[PDB]
Design a protein around this ligand. Structure first.
Ligand SMILES: [Mg+2]
Ligand SMILES: [Zn+2]
Ligand SMILES: [Zn+2]
Ligand SMILES: [Zn+2]
Lengths: 519, 84, 35, 171, 58, 168, 262, 93, 88
DNA sequence: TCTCGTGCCTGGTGTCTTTAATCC
DNA sequence: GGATTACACCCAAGACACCAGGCACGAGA
RNA sequence: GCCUGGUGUCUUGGGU
C-alpha cells in the first residue's frame, strides 16, 4: 500500500537456493566496469564515470534519479558493477576446501583417484548427503599417494605422484616426491595454475565430488572478477556537516583498485620477478581482508586511525551484526516506554496509559458506513485535542498531515480511506517487560487513558512480569491492523493467561497489601 | 489429488483457538472493507463485534484448509465445525 | 517446543552430588567426564 | 497457426465483490481481460472455450490484505504464427519497400530484396497492383508466403515473410 | 552460532533450504507455518449462494 | 500475467537450441510440446487445429454465448459484435473474415467428412489439411518433412479434399 | 647482485650509507667487499647490492636502522641484471594534464618549451573572476571559461597584439591563457579525456500575547501555531502549550495590549 | 524488539502479529526477482512499465516480493562475496 | 534550515537571558558556507526536544585558536510528581 | 628588484622494538 | 594447539591522521 | 504551493 502499483504478480518465497556466482554471470548482471580509484571527477562536483561512485550504480541522494531504473532513491535497490582482476586470486573463505580438493584429484588431468571397482569406495558413493559422501571419498583417496595412469586398462591418469599440499597463510605449498630418498622440490601452487586444472574436471567427476554443475562449479571458488556493491551497501556519512568520510569498504575497494592497476603496470616493462611476487601477493592480501579481516596467524589490516578495518565477515557476526542485530531482532515503530506504577482500582486486564503517549501513538481505522459520522468528529478536533486524529490516508497512499492543514473543515471522508486516530479506551495493546523469560512476559491489556506519566498496572499482574515499582520500565506495542487486534484479544489477553502450562497452576494471585489484609 | 474426500475427513471436529482467532480477524477485516454482512447489526457496530456475532450464529462464509504434514489437506467449512 | 524451552529455563534462573546450574550444564553439554 | 490451450489466470478480488453472483462476475472479468490480447509465449488469444461454465476453484484469502485470489483455469482458442510455416494472406498495403499483408489479427512485412525481379510495382495502373501476364495481386488476392523470422514485443509480435522461393506468390 | 562458516559451506555444497522452519519465514518476513498461520482460509462460494439476489456482483 | 500448466523451467547445464520455433524441424517451443497436460494432470496430445475445425468451434462458441447473453434466444459481421470493447471487436472480426476467405469446407457436413478422413505426428496431420495441394509433387516441396516417411495415400488425400471442395 | 628489503622511503638513504661505509674502509684490513649499490624508484622498498660473497651483503647492512633484520635478501639472476638499470615524450600541439595549481587536473595544449628544456608554455581555458571580489586555491577556484576581453574592459587590462591581452599579469590570446609550467608539473602519459573535454575540444504568529478571559487571564505567552480560530499559545508560566480561542487574546503593539483591531 | 520477544510471540502462536511487527511496522521493502535465475537482478522502470533481466533475456517471467530491507541488504552483501542466494517462489522436490 | 522557530535570536546570533525556550527552538544560530549567491548551510543548535526552561546566562569568549566561542546555560525547575524516585 | 627563507596547504603513505576454562 | 563461549534491555557524557615536499609571499639586502 | 537531512565508532559511568 506504501508501494506504488506494479503489474508484476506478487508471490512469496518458497525456497532459497545457495550457490556461487560464475564469472560470466557477474558480468551479465553488472551495469558498469570499474577501473579508476579516483572517486571524484576533479573535485569539481559530479562523480567520475567508471569510478566507484559512478551514477549508474545508484542514487543515495534525494535529487538525482537513477540512470538505470528511473526510480527515486527510496525505491531504487541499487545495481552491481564488476571489477576485472588482472590475475586470478583465491577466495579467502574457501581455501581449506580447495586444499581438500587437491588431495582428491590428479594435479595434471583432474580425475578422481578411485573407481566403483574398489568395494568400500563403491559403498561410499551411495551416501545420499553430498557433504558426507565427499568426506567419505576423501577419507579413502587421502592414502592413495600417486595418481595411477593405469587401473589398479587406463583410467585417464597421467602417472604422476601426488604432492602433499600444505597451507601457509594465504599461500599453498605442494611437496612432490620425485622418484630411495632423494630430494623433493616444493614449488608454490599459484591460483592461476590451480585455475586451469579445475576447468578440466569432467562433469561426472564434478558430481562425485559433491559439487553441482549448475550452481556450485568448483572453479568458481577462485576469484577472477569482483562484484562491486552499489552505494546502498557502503553509504557516506557526514562527521561535521560539510565533511564526509567514506565507509571502510569504499576505502578498501580503492586499495584493491590501485593494487590492480600496478599488476597491469608490471607485465609490460620492468619486472624484476621478485617484485612480481610482492605485488601479486599484496593483491591477494587486500582481496582477502576485504572479505574477512580475522584471518588467524597474520596481522589485521588497519585503518590510518589504527583500528582494524570492518570487513564483510565482521558485518554479519556477533550481537550487533546483520543477523543477530537486524534480522532476528530489530527496532520497531509504534512503541513506548516509561516508569510503571500500581493501581488497585483498575481491572486485571487494564493498563493506564498517559495522555501524552496516547496522543503520539495511533491506530489506522478504516472508514465504513457505521463509523463515518464518528470519525469526522475526530478529524475536526485535530492532532492537539483528545479525542482526535493525525492523518487521513487515501487509497492511493497520499497522507494528509493534519498539523499543517489549515482547511481541515473542508475534508469529506470517502469509504475505504483510513484515519489514523488517537489511541482510545478499550483498544488492545501488547505490554512487555524485559527480560522476556517466558510467555507471560507479553500479555495484551486494554488501554485506559489517564493523566500523569506512568503506566498503571493492576497489582495482581506484577508477579508474572516479575515487575515491581522501584524504577522498572515496561514497553507497550500497538497493533496496526484489524487482523492483529483480534489475535491479541483472542489469544494473548490477560484472563487467558491466568493458568500457566509450566506447572498446571496459576501464576497470578492476591498479593501484598490485599493478601495481608484479607487474612 | 491432494484433497481428501468429505466422508474420509479425520481431523478434529472442534474449532481450535488458533483457527477461531484467524477466522474472527479475517472476517472482521473484510467487514471493515465493506463486505456484505450476513447478520442483522443492531447497536454493536465495532468490526470485531459484528464478526463475533456472525460466529455465534454459525454464519461466517469461510472454509478452513487444514494442512496435514505430508502436504495433503482437508477443507472444513466454518459452518460445520463445532464451536465451544 | 518453545513452551518446553521456557518451562525448563525459567526455574533455573532462580536456583555430596553436584546440583543446580553446574549439574544442569553437564547434561545439555553431554560431557563425557562429569564432575 | 491455431491451437487449443489450457491456460490459467490469477485474479485478485476485492472483498466488496463477495456476493451471490461472484462466479458470474469472475467469468465476465476473465473474458474482458484475456480476449483479444497477445503474448509472445502463446500468441493471440482469440476466444475462450465454454466461458459461462468455467470452474474457478476456491479463492485463497491473502494474509494481511483481505482480498481474495482465484486461479481461474480455462481453455481457449489461441493463434500464434511460426517461423517456417507457409501461409496464405490478404495484402493490406503496397509500397516501394514491399507489401504488408493481414493474416488474421496481425500484419506481415515482406521486403524488396526477398521479392522476385519480375514482380514490378505499377502505380500508373488503375487500381494499383503488382502485375504480370496471368498473375494479379490486388487487395484480397490470394498469395502464398513463408514466415522466415519472428520478433517479439510481448504486446504484439512481428513476423517477416518472403516470396523469394519456389511455388510462393499469387495463385 | 558459526554464522559465516555455515553460509560459506552452504554455498560450496549448493544447499537447498525448503523454508519450512519458523526462523526461515520470520527473517524473510512471511507468515510462518505456526498457530494462526498453520492453515489457509478459503472463500465458501457454496454458502454465498443462499444470499438474496440484490446482493450480487455486477 | 497469464500462465499455464507447464512450469519451473529451471536452469540446466547443457543448453538447447531445439527450442527456436521452426515448423520444418517440429520445434514448437516448451509450451507446445507433443505431450501436454490439462488442468487435472492428465496426459493429452497437442491440439493443433485446421482452418475447417477452427471455423466451426469459434463460430459455435460465439453464438452459444450470444444466446446465453440473451437468456436463450450465419453472417460473420453480425457474429463479431458479441465481443466487448473495440480492441476485442477488431481481432475477432478480422479472424472470421480471414477464415471466411480461406476455409474451403465452410459447413459441418463436409467438415465431419474431412474430420473422419484425417482421423504419425499430430502436427503434420494438421498441416496437410491447412495447405491445399494438387499433386504429391506439390506437397513434399512446400512441406519438406513429408519426404522420408514412405507412407503416401497423399494422392487420395488430395483427391478427396479437391472433390469435397465446392466450386467457386 | 642481491636485492634487500628496506623501509619504504629509505632506499636512497641506505644507498648513501653503504657508500660511506665502503669509502671509509677502503685500504684497511677489513674493506667492505661490495662493488656498488643502487635503488630504483620503480622498485619501492628494495636496494640492490653488488658483491662476490653473501657475507659482504650482511657486512654492508650491519647496524643499518633502515633495513629489515629478517634475513631477507634475495639473489638476482645474471639475465635480470640489465633490466634493473633501464633508465626509462611531449610535443608541441599535443595535450597534457596539469598537475599543480588552480588548473590542476585540467587538459591543456602544449604550445612551446623553454630553450633550456624545463618549463613548457601551455594553452589553457582560464578560470577567472575579473577582479570581482578583490581588495587562489584549487579548492576555491572559479569555473573554466574563455577569457572575454570586453568583460575585462567593462569590469576591471593591457592590449599586446591582435587578440592578445595581458590581464592581471597573465597573457590571454584568443581567449586562452598561455602560461609556463614546469615539465615535471604536467602529465603526458595515459591521459583520459573526459566527457566534458570531448564536448569542448497570518500576521500574529510569534508575537507576544496577553490573555484577557478565562482561567489563564493575565498570563504572557507566544503564538506557537495559528491554524484557524484556535491558537496555540506557549504559555510562559507553566511548561505547557495550550489550545485557545481567538476571542481570548490581547496582542502587544506600539501602544499596549490591543484587542482584535490590530 | 529483541530475540526474546520474538520467542514469546511464537509461544502465544500469534504468527500474524509477529509478521506485521517485523515488516509493515518497520522496514518493509519491495524487490523484483527473475523467475528463471532467481536473482534480484531485475531492472524495473515503473513509469515506462518495462522489466528485463538482461542475463536471462526475460521480460515475462518476473515476480515481486515483499521482504525486509535488512534482508535485501544481507543478500547484496552476500553477492559481494560471490555467494548467490537464489529466491524461487515454487517448490519442485 | 531547521523546522523550529528562529524568532528568539537577537542580531548577534545569540539568545538573551530571561527568554523561555521550548524544544527544537534555535538558541545559537550558526552557518557554514557551501563550496563551489545563496551559499550557506545551517549549522545551528536546537534545544533538546524533551526540555524547556529559561535561558539563564550566556558566556561569550574566544578559544585557544582565536575564533568565537559561546556557552548557553538553561535553568528549569523540577517539581516532584508521580513516577519520581526517592530513597531513605 | 631579486633572492632566500619560512609558513601553509595538499598529497601520499608506517614501524624503535614491547584470561580463563572447555570440546574437537 | 589451535579458536569459540561467555544475560537482556536502556540511559547519558566524552572524543577524532601525520609527515614531507612544493609553492607562494614577505622581508631584507 | 505541496516535499522536507544532521553522523558514526568506541570507551567509560549508570538503571532493572
Ligand atoms: Mg525492580
Ligand atoms: Zn536504480
Ligand atoms: Zn593427470
Ligand atoms: Zn534472470
Amino acid at each position: 500500500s506504501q508501494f506504488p502499483y506494479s503489474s508484476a504478480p506478487l508471490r512469496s518465497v518458497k525456497e532459497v537456493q545457495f550457490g556461487l556466482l560464475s564469472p560470466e554471470e557477474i558480468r551479465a548482471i553488472s551495469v558498469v566496469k570499474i577501473e579508476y580509484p579516483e572517486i571524484m571527477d576533479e573535485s569539481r562536483q559530479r562523480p567520475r564515470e567508471g569510478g566507484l561512485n559512478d551514477p549508474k550504480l545508484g542514487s543515495i541522494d534525494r535529487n538525482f534519479k537513477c540512470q538505470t531504473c528511473g526510480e527515486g532513491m527510496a525505491e531504487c535497490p541499487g545495481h552491481f558493477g564488476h571489477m576485472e582482476l588482472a590475475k586470478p586470486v583465491f577466495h579467502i573463505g574457501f581455501i581449506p576446501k580447495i586444499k581438500k580438493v587437491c588431495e582428491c584429484i590428479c594435479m595434471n588431468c583432474g580425475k578422481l583417484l578411485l573407481d566403483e571397482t574398489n568395494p568400500t569406495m563403491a559403498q561410499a558413493i551411495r551416501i545420499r548427503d553430498p557433504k558426507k559422501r565427499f568426506n567419505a571419498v576423501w577419507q579413502l583417496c587421502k592414502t592413495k599417494m600417486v595418481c595411477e595412469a593405469d587401473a589398479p586398462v587406463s583410467r585417464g591418469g597421467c602417472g604422476n605422484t601426488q604432492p602433499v599440499v600444505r597451507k601457509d597463510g594465504m599461500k599453498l605449498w605442494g611437496t612432490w616426491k620425485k622418484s630411495r630418498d632423494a630430494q623433493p622440490e616444493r614449488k608454490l601452487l599459484t591460483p592461476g595454475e590451480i585455475l586451469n586444472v579445475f576447468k578440466h574436471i569432467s562433469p561426472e567427476d564434478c558430481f562425485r565430488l559433491g559439487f553441482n554443475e549448475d550452481y556450485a562449479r568448483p572453479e568458481w571458488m577462485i576469484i577472477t572478477v569482483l562484484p562491486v556493491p552499489p552505494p546502498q551497501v557502503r553509504p557516506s556519512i557526514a562527521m561535521d556537516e560539510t565533511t564526509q568520510g567514506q565507509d571502510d569498504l569504499t576505502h578498501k575497494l580503492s586499495d584493491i583498485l590501485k593494487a590492480n592497476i600496478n599488476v597491469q603496470k608490471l607485465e609490460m616493462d620492468g619486472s624484476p620477478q621478485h617484485i612480481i611476487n610482492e605485488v601479486e601477493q599484496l593483491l591477494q592480501f587486500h582481496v582477502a581482508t576485504y572479505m574477512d579481516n580475522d584471518i588467524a596467524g597474520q596481522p589485521q589490516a588497519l585503518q590510518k586511525s589504527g583500528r582494524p578495518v570492518k570487513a564483510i565477515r565482521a558485518r554479519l557476526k556477533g550481537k550487533e551484526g546483520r543477523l543477530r542485530g537486524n534480522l532476528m531482532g530489530k527496532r520497531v515503530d509504534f512503541s513506548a516506554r516509561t516508569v510503571i506504577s500500581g493501581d488497585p482500582n483498575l481491572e486485571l486486564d487494564q493498563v493506564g496509559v498517559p495522555i501524552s503517549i496516547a496522543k503520539t501513538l495511533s491506530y489506522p481505522e478504516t472508514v465504513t458506513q457505521y463509523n463515518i459520522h464518528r470519525l469526522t468528529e475526530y478529524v475536526r478536533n485535530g492532532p492537539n485535542e483528545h479525542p482526535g486524529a493525525k492523518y487521513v490516508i487515501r487509497d492511493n497512499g497520499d497522507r494528509i498531515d493534519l498539523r499543517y492543514h489549515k482547511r481541515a473543515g473542508d475534508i469529506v471522508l470517502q469509504y475505504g480511506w483510513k484515519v489514523e486516530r488517537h489511541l482510545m479506551d478499550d483498544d488492545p495493546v501488547l505490554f512487555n517487560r524485559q527480560p522476556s523469560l517466558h510467555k507471560m512476559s507479553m500479555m495484551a491489556h486494554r488501554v485506559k487513558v489517564m493523566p500523569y506519566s506512568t503506566f498503571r498496572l493492576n497489582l495482581s499482574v506484577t508477579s508474572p512480569y516479575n515487575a515491581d515499582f522501584d524504577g522498572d520500565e515496561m514497553n507497550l506495542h500497538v497493533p496496526q491492523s484489524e487482523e492483529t487486534r483480534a489475535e491479541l484479544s483472542q489469544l494473548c489477553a490477560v484472563p487467558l493467561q491466568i493458568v500457566s502450562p509450566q506447572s498446571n497452576k496459576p501464576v497470578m494471585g492476591i498479593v501484598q497489601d490485599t493478601l495481608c489484609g484479607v487474612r | 489429488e491432494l484433497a481428501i474426500l468429505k466422508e474420509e475427513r479425520t481431523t478434529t471436529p472442534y474449532l481450535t483457538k488458533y483457527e477461531r482467532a484467524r477466522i474472527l480477524g479475517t472476517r472482521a477485516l473484510q467487514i471493515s472493507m465493506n463486505a456484505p454482512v450476513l447478520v442483522d447489526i443492531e447497536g454493536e457496530t465495532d468490526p470485531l463485534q459484528i464478526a463475533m456475532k456472525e460466529l455465534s450464529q454459525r454464519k461466517i462464509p469461510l472454509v478452513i484448509r487444514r494442512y496435514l504434514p505430508d502436504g495433503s489437506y482437508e477443507d472444513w467449512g466454518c459452518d460445520e465445525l463445532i464451536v465451544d | 517446543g518453545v513452551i518446553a524451552a521456557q518451562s525448563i529455563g525459567e526455574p533455573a534462573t532462580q536456583m555430596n552430588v553436584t546440583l543446580g546450574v553446574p549439574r544442569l550444564k553437564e547434561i545439555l553439554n553431554v560431557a563425557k567426564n562429569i564432575k | 497457426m491455431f491451437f487449443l490451450k489450457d491456460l490459467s489466470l490469477i485474479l485478485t478480488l476485492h472483498p466488496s465483490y463477495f456476493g451471490p453472483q461472484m462466479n458470474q462476475y469472475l467469468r465476465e472479468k476473465l473474458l474482458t481481460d484475456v480476449e483479444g490480447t497477445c503474448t509472445g509465449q502463446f500468441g493471440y488469444i482469440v476466444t475462450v472455450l465454454d466461458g459461462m461454465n468455467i470452474d474457478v476453484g476456491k479463492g485463497r484469502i491473502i494474509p494481511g490484505s483481505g482480498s481474495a485470489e482465484f486461479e481461474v483455469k480455462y481453455r481457449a482458442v489461441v493463434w500464434k504464427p511460426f517461423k517456417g510455416e507457409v501461409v496464405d494472406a490478404i495484402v493490406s498495403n503496397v509500397s516501394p519497400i514491399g507489401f504488408f499483408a493481414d493474416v488474421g489479427p496481425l500484419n506481415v512485412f515482406v521486403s524488396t530484396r526477398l521479392i522476385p525481379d519480375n514482380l514490378v510495382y505499377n502505380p500508373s495502373n488503375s487500381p494499383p497492383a503488382y502485375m504480370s501476364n496471368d498473375e494479379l495481386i490486388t487487395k484480397g488476392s490470394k498469395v502464398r508466403l513463408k514466415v522466415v523470422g519472428t520478433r517479439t514485443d510481448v504486446n504484439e509480435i512481428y513476423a517477416i515473410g518472403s516470396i523469394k522461393e519456389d511455388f510462393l506468390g499469387a495463385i | 552460532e558459526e554464522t559465516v562458516e555455515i553460509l560459506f559451506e552452504a554455498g560450496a555444497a549448493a544447499e537447498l533450504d525448503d523454508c519450512r522452519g519458523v526462523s526461515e519465514n520470520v527473517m524473510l518476513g512471511q507468515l510462518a507455518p505456526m498457530g494462526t498461520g498453520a492453515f489457509d482460509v478459503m472463500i465458501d462460494e457454496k454458502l454465498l449462494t443462499s444470499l438474496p439476489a440484490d446482493y450480487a456482483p455486477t | 500475467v497469464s500462465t499455464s500448466t507447464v512450469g519451473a523451467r529451471r536452469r540446466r547445464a547443457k543448453q538447447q537450441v531445439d527450442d527456436e520455433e521452426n515448423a520444418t524441424l517440429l520445434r514448437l517451443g516448451p509450451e507446445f510440446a507433443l505431450k501436454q497436460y490439462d488442468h487435472d494432470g492428465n496426459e493429452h496430445d497437442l491440439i493443433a487445429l485446421s482452418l475447417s475445425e477452427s471455423r466451426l468451434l469459434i463460430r459455435e462458441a460465439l453464438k452459444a454465448r450470444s444466446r446465453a447473453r440473451n437468456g436463450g434466444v450465419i453472417d460473420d459481421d453480425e457474429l463479431a459484435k458479441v465481443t466487448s470493447g473495440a480492441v476485442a471487436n477488431g481481432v475477432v472480426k478480422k479472424t472470421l473474415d480471414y477464415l471466411n476467405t480461406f476455409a474451403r469446407f465452410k459447413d459441418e457436413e463436409t467438415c465431419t467428412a474431412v474430420d473422419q478422413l484425417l482421423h504419425l505426428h499430430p502436427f503434420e496431420i494438421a498441416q496437410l489439411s491447412s495447405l491445399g495441394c494438387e499433386d504429391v509433387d506439390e506437397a513434399i516441396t512446400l512441406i519438406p518433412s513429408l519426404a522420408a516417411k514412405k507412407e503416401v495415400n497423399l494422392q487420395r488425400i488430395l483427391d478427396e479434399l479437391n472433390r469435397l471442395e465446392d466450386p467457386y | 647482485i642481491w636485492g634487500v628489503k628496506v623501509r619504504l622511503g629509505k632506499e636512497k638513504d641506505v644507498v648513501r650509507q653503504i657508500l660511506k661505509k665502503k669509502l671509509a674502509r677502503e685500504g684497511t684490513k677489513n674493506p667492505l667487499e661490495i662493488y656498488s649499490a643502487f635503488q630504483r624508484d620503480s622498485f619501492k622498498g628494495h636496494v640492490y647490492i653488488e658483491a662476490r660473497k653473501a657475507e659482504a651483503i650482511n657486512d654492508a647492512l650491519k647496524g643499518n636502522v633502515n633495513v629489515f633484520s629478517n634475513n631477507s635478501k634475495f639473489l638476482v639472476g645474471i639475465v635480470e641484471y640489465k633490466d634493473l638499470l633501464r633508465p626509462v615524450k611531449l610535443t608541441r600541439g599535443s595535450y597534457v594534464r596539469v598537475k599543480n595549481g588552480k588548473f590542476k587536473g585540467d587538459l591543456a595544449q602544449v604550445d612551446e618549451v623553454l630553450e633550456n628544456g624545463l618549463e613548457a608554455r601551455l594553452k589553457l581555458v582560464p578560470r577567472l573572476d575579473y577582479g570581482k571580489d578583490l581588495s587562489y586555491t584549487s579548492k576555491f577556484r572559479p569555473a573554466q571559461r574563455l577569457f572575454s576581453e570586453a568583460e575585462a574592459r567593462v569590469h576591471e587590462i593591457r592590449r599586446d597584439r591582435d587578440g592578445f591581452v595581458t590581464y592581471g599579469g597573465e597573457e590571454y590570446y584568443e581567449g586562452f591563457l598561455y602560461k609556463t609550467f614546469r615539465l615535471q608539473n604536467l602529465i603526458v602519459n595515459s591521459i583520459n579525456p573526459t566527457l566534458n573535454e570531448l564536448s569542448l575540444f497570518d500576521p500574529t504568529l510569534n508575537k507576544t500575547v496577553k490573555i484577557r478571559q478565562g482561567g489563564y487571564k493575565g498570563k504572557i505567552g507566544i503564538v506557537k501555531e495559528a491554524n484557524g480560530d484556535r491558537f496555540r499559545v506557549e504559555l510562559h508560566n507553566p511548561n505547557k502549550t495550550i489550545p485557545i480561542p481567538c476571542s481570548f487574546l490581547l496582542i502587544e503593539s506600539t501602544h499596549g495590549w490591543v484587542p482584535y483591531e490590530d | 524488539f529483541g530475540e526474546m520477544e520474538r520467542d514469546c510471540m511464537i509461544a502465544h502462536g500469534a504468527a500474524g502479529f509477529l509478521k506485521e511487527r517485523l515488516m509493515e511496522a518497520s522496514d518493509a521493502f519491495r524487490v523484483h526477482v527473475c523467475g528463471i535465475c532467481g536473482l534480484m537482478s531485475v531492472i524495473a522502470n515503473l513509469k515506462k512499465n518495462q522489466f528485463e533481466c538482461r542475463s536471462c533475456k526475460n521480460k515475462t517471467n518476473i515476480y515481486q516480493l515483499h521482504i525486509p530491507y535488512a534482508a535485501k541488504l544481507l543478500f547484496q552483501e552476500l553477492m559481494a562475496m560471490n555467494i548467490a542466494p537464489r529466491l524461487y517462489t515454487e517448490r519442485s522436490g | 534550515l531547521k523546522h523550529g522557530t528562529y524568532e528568539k535570536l537577537d542580531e548577534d546570533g545569540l539568545i538573551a537571558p530571561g527568554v523561555r525556550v521550548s524544544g527544537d527552538d534555535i538558541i545559537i544560530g550558526k552557518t557554514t558556507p557551501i563550496p563551489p549567491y545563496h551559499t550557506k548551510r545551517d549549522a545551528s543548535t536546537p534545544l533538546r526536544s524533551t526540555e524547556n526552561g529559561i535561558v539563564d546566562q550566556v558566556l561569550l569568549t574566544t578559544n585557544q585558536e582565536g575564533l568565537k566561542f559561546v556557552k548557553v546555560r538553561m535553568r528549569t525547575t523540577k517539581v516532584p510528581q508521580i513516577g519520581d524516585k526517592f530513597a531513605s
